Amino acid sequence: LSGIDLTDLDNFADGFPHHLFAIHRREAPVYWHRPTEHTPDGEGFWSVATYAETLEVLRDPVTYSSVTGGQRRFGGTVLQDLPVAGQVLNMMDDPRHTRIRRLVSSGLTPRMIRRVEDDLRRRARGLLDGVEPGAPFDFVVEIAAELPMQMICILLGVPETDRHWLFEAVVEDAGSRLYTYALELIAGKRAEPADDMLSVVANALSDAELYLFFHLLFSAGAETTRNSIAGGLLALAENPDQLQTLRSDFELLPTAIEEIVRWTSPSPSKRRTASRAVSLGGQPIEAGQKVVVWEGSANRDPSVFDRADEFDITRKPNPHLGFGQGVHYCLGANLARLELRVLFEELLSRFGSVRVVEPAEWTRSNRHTGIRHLVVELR
Amino acid sequence: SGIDLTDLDNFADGFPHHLFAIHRREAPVYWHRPTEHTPDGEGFWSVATYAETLEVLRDPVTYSSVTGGQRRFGGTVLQDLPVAGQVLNMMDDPRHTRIRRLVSSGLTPRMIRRVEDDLRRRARGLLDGVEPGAPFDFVVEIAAELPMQMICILLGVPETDRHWLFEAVEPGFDFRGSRRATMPRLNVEDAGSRLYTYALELIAGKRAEPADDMLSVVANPALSDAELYLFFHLLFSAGAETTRNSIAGGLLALAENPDQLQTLRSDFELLPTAIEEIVRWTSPSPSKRRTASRAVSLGGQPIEAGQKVVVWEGSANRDPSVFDRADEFDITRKPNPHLGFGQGVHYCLGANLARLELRVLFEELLSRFGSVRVVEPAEWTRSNRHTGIRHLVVELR
Numbered sequence: 122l123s124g125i126d127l128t129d130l131d132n133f134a135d136g137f138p139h140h141l142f143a144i145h146r147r148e149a150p151v152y153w154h155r156p157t158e159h160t161p162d163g164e165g166f167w168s169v170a171t172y173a174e175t176l177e178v179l180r181d182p183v184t185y186s187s188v189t190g191g192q193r194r195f196g197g198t199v200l201q202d203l204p205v206a207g208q209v210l211n212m213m214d215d216p217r218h219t220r221i222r223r224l225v226s227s228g229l230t231p232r233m234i235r236r237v238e239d240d241l242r243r244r245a246r247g248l249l250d251g252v253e254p255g256a257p258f259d260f261v262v263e264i265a266a267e268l269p270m271q272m273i274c275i276l277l278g279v280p281e282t283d284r285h286w287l288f289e290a291v292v293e294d295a296g297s298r299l300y301t302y303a304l305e306l307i308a309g310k311r312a313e314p315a316d317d318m319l320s321v322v323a324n325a326l327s328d329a330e331l332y333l334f335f336h337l338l339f340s341a342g343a344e345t346t347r348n349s350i351a352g353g354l355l356a357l358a359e360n361p362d363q364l365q366t367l368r369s370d371f372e373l374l375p376t377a378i379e380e381i382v383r384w385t386s387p388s389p390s391k392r393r394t395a396s397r398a399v400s401l402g403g404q405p406i407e408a409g410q411k412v413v414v415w416e417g418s419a420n421r422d423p424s425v426f427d428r429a430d431e432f433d434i435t436r437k438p439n440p441h442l443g444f445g446q447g448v449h450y451c452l453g454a455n456l457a458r459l460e461l462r463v464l465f466e467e468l469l470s471r472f473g474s475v476r477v478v479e480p481a482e483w484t485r486s487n488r489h490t491g492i493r494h495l496v497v498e499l500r
Numbered sequence: 501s502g503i504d505l506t507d508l509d510n511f512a513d514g515f516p517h518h519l520f521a522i523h524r525r526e527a528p529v530y531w532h533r534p535t536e537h538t539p540d541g542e543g544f545w546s547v548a549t550y551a552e553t554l555e556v557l558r559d560p561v562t563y564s565s566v567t568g569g570q571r572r573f574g575g576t577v578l579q580d581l582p583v584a585g586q587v588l589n590m591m592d593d594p595r596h597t598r599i600r601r602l603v604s605s606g607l608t609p610r611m612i613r614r615v616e617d618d619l620r621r622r623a624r625g626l627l628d629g630v631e632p633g634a635p636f637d638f639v640v641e642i643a644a645e646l647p648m649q650m651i652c653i654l655l656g657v658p659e660t661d662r663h664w665l666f667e668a669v670e671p672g673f674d675f676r677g678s679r680r681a682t683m684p685r686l687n688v689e690d691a692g693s694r695l696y697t698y699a700l701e702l703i704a705g706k707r708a709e710p711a712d713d714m715l716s717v718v719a720n721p722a723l724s725d726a727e728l729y730l731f732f733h734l735l736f737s738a739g740a741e742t743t744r745n746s747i748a749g750g751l752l753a754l755a756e757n758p759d760q761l762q763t764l765r766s767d768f769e770l771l772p773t774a775i776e777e778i779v780r781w782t783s784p785s786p787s788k789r790r791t792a793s794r795a796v797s798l799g800g801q802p803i804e805a806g807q808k809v810v811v812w813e814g815s816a817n818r819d820p821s822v823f824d825r826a827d828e829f830d831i832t833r834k835p836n837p838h839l840g841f842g843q844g845v846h847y848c849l850g851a852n853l854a855r856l857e858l859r860v861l862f863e864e865l866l867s868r869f870g871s872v873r874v875v876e877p878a879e880w881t882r883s884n885r886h887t888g889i890r891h892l893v894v895e896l897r
């Protein structure tokens with residue numbers, strides 16, 4: 122570990138670096154990572170790589186805050202302290218967290234879920250019908266990015282005419298245009314309430330807080346869910362025999378989808394801040410210190426998962442942390458599973474041959490594990 | 501009752517002086533109800549007269565640049581922004597005094613001359629390249645570069661990084677075909693962005709090897725890294741954008757007042773007074789917001805703690821009860837107690853750099869050119885926080 126820098130993104134440019142985390146779990150499940158030139162804020166942090174300790178942190182939001190602690194003015198849930206800590210749901214603590222979380226969940230109505238599902242079915246079929254068998258194409262740009270972006274446009278109530286602002290955002294100007302458009306959409310919901318999540322929250326927060334919420338959702342669909350779809354396809358391509366088994370029996374799909382989420386772990390790390398002295402993994406943490414947990418590593422901890430380094434679509438049980446755990450548990454878990462189920466039903470219905478014909482290209486990040494391009498041939 | 505000061509259509513053609521004449525006459529201090537265009541869906545007190553504007557600016561305890569009442573955060577634009585309290589212009593005492601003094605300590609005589617020497621050579625070179633009589637866009641070709649270079653020099657940005665940085669940090673952007681600007685943001689997607697990474701590496705370098713520039717002084721509560729990034733951005737919006745806009749706006753005013761143009765260029769002793777009239781007339785930063793920290797009466801209106809107050813220096817600067825012939829450009833105007841650079845504890849820290857940029861630019865321009873024709877209608881930045889020209893196509897002879 123002394124020679125390993127978990128903040129050096131050159132180590133994450135080719136996928137989540139599982140080999141480094143095998144060393145981390147073996148050598149020191151919890152340890153103090155000194156800051157390097159690559160470390161946000163030039164400040165060290167406790168790094169947590171094993172499942173039991175990761176789960177312990179996630180399950181104690183009072184000790185391990187998503188806002189701040191000690192003398193630290195602001196924190197949040199990435200390693201860089203952010204002044205928007207305390208102002209968006211995933212960087213909030215009780216009592217305001219419980220209130221806003223319930224308001225957000227009140228927007229995920231059965232009719233909204235049906236609206237998303239109906240659209241998803243129609244679109245997945247259209248896209249898969251358009252595939253030319255045997256002809257290489259970039260599955261990320263043409264399919265994996267498209268479906269969940271449309272899902273979040275429905276949840277947020279973005280009209281077809283205006284969806285390009287969102288696509289274009291996935292340059293500083295692109296970001297400013299997304300921001301400006303989001304503020305216009307939010308004011309529009311205030312003027313004319315609608316039956317969607319943004320309206321629910323806007324009409325219950327400042328516009329700035331509503332933007333943070335908008336972007337949280339936009340990112341969850343446009344990036345995290347896209348990453349699970351692309352990585353699920355890559356995993357199945359790398360395991361053709363399981364692809365065949367799953368194609369032969371879609372009743373296997375729910376268990377397979379949990380294994381895709383464990384395997385891909387698209388959101389592989391989270392930061393918290395200690396609010397008081399506490400011990401974790403037998404080490405003493407002081408109020409104010411940063412704690413980073415690595416669900417991407419926890420999800421391959423062999424203390425918890427048998428043959429943890431193997432993809433197995435029949436895996437049971439499968440208590441993965443890919444959607445988090447505790448009071449901030451992912452509010453979109455069933456929507457993500459829905460996206461994966463519909464896509465793989467439709468894809469595996471038509472194709473039982475998936476070949477990746479160029480090396481996968483990955484996003485360079487230790488906060489997201491994602492594939493930027495994945496050229497495949499489907500037969 | 502039919503005017504919406506938050507509808508940017510009213511600002512799309514320049515600052516709407518006619519609307520603010522109405523505002524000063526009918527109600528110097530006015531509760532503006534929220535419309536579809538109003539940030540946060542929340543009303544605010546609107547202040548259009550000079551005296552009442554100063555009552556607000558001169559009382560930073562009652563009219564906070566951070567927040568007030570029960571409001572979680574406020575700041576100095578109409579929209580509530582979470583960077584309130586984290587960037588110098590949106591700080592109150594006691595922190596404001598300490599950071600303003602610190603930033604100010606970076607403005608050494610040495611730095612001023614460094615800026616002046618570079619500005620002189622650049623302005624001379626650009627104006628030397630002008631083909632007399634040939635139309636060109638003054639904003640893009642001359643006015644835009646100079647203050648961006650000034651900021652790079654204050655911040656100690658290496659010359660070799662400036663081409664890249666200019667494209668990245670440019671405060672303006674196009675949206676639906678109009679130019680806009682924003683205040684610096686630091687939301688989740690901005691964390692470890694390319695500009696965040698660049699800025700904090702630049703800061704790391706100056707912590708390892710302190711340099712003779714303002715970013716080194718400030719980087720060596722003190723400003724957290726997040727706050728240093730917001731400060732880096734602040735100088736490009738607060739300093740480079742406004743100064744560019746005063747330059748383009750000053751050229752337009754001179755073009756529209758050919759007799760003033762002749763008087764000025766035939767006696768440069770008048771420059772100092774001319775430059776203050778340019779700032780008054782153009783008022784590049786025409787509005788500010790504050791938040792009331794207690795119940796208070798202003799212009800006979802009962803403001804409550806937590807409520808938003810917007811002052812319009814752009815309107816105050818043409819208040820005919822303080823400026824004679826307020827609606828006329830007069831390069832000899834004296835006295836000229838304009839509010840273009842603010843007033844009180846937040847008075848512009850860069851005012852003398854702005855005056856320097858305007859001085860050098862106009863010495864170089866007017867000594868060469870006595871004829872300035874605007875050959876198309878000016879296009880304006882769509883904003884009520886910045887008054888500025890997007891394009892100004894001119895012929896110089």
Ligand code: HEM
Nearest residue numbers: 210211341345346349388443444445449451452453456457
């Ligand atoms: C495979 C796709 C996804 C994965 C892997 C994922 C993962 C996660 C994780 C790990 C958290 C916990 C954050 C923490 O502990 O700090 C979370 C929270 C959250 N997720 Fe997701 N997510 C996914 C898709 C979605 C979607 C489609 C939505 C749309 C509703 C969504 C909405 C949210 C929200 C609103 C939170 C904040 C909950 C809270 O802080 O109370 N996610 N997600």
Ligand code: HEM
Nearest residue numbers: 588589600738739742743746785841842846848849850854
């Ligand atoms: C014509 C050009 C400029 C104009 C019209 C202008 C205008 C203003 C105004 C009206 C304020 C008051 C803010 C408030 O009351 O809330 C201000 C503050 C400030 N300005 Fe300028 N400015 C110009 C150029 C510059 C330059 C060139 C710099 C730096 C190089 C600069 C840096 C600042 C800073 C740091 C503050 C905040 C000071 C504080 O809060 O203590 N400005 N400016």
